[PDB]
Amino acid sequence: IVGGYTCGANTVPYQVSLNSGYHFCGGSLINSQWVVSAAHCYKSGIQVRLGEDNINVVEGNEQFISASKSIVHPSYNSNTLNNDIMLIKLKSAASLNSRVASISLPTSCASAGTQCLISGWGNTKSSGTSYPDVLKCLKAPILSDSSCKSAYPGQITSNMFCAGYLEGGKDSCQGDSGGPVVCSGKLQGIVSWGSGCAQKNKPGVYTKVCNYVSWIKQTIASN
Ligand SMILES: NC(=[NH2+])c1ccc2[nH]c(-c3ccccc3O)nc2c1
Numbered sequence: 001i002v003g004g005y006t007c008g009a010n011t012v013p014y015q016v017s018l019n020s021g022y023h024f025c026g027g028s029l030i031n032s033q034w035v036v037s038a039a040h041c042y043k044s045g046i047q048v049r050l051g052e053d054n055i056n057v058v059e060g061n062e063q064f065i066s067a068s069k070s071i072v073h074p075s076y077n078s079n080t081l082n083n084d085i086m087l088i089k090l091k092s093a094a095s096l097n098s099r100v101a102s103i104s105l106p107t108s109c110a111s112a113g114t115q116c117l118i119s120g121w122g123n124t125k126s127s128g129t130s131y132p133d134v135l136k137c138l139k140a141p142i143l144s145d146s147s148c149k150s151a152y153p154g155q156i157t158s159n160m161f162c163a164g165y166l167e168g169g170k171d172s173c174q175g176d177s178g179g180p181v182v183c184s185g186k187l188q189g190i191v192s193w194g195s196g197c198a199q200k201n202k203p204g205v206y207t208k209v210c211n212y213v214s215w216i217k218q219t220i221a222s223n
């Protein structure tokens with residue numbers, strides 16, 4: 001996250017870190033046994049880490065659970081990142097409390113202008129790298145589809161939305177992929193992609209979760 005602030009330990013209780021020997025993507029806990037992330041974050045041997053603040057120090061509220069199965073969206077296209085969403089089922093259910101809790105899926109899609117909270121352990125610099133050990137947060141608005149397609153001609157589909165600042169300086173970044181975009185207590189986006197990070201007129205692009213609620217609910221019900 002570039003231009004954000006330190007969230008504070010366990011104030012984003014649904015945030016998870018996907019680990020394969022190291023942190024490589026974020027995710028969101030939607031119920032005690034399922035996590036949603038970005039399809040481009042897929043790999044085998046994923047351990048899901050809940051209740052994390054500093055990912056290099058066991059501070060006491062962590063739950064490390066391995067995934068039993070991963071389901072990448074049937075129409076995921078890795079060249080265009082269209083339908084960049086995946087579900088991960090945990091081998092055992094997590095113990096939910098105030099520091100580890102699930103986030104609700106949306107009943108309606110959010111409109112441009114809505115302010116949301118984006119979080120993650122990704123790079124904090126636009127040029128150069130500095131990965132934080134503790135969770136960073138950014139409050140950003142969803143941009144209109146017109147501004148979004150204007151910033152990324154020929155690359156935005158109905159399954160994506162842009163959120164951020166056209167002026168630059170504040171954005172999610174590498175290492176934040178797969179994480180949450182929460183607006184009014186509902187999970188509306190998944191950090192997906194961007195051109196660089198926090199550059200002027202290049203806002204972040206997010207998977208539009210409201211378009212996958214039926215697929216998520218049906219998949220969970222049968223697996
Ligand atoms: N500017 C952004 N909003 C952004 C967000 C997540 C990203 N994730 C990545 C990324 C880069 C290389 C490999 C995997 C990634 O998720 N770039 C990213 C850029």
Ligand SMILES: [Ca+2]
Binds near residue numbers: 053057062
């Ligand atoms: Ca920790």
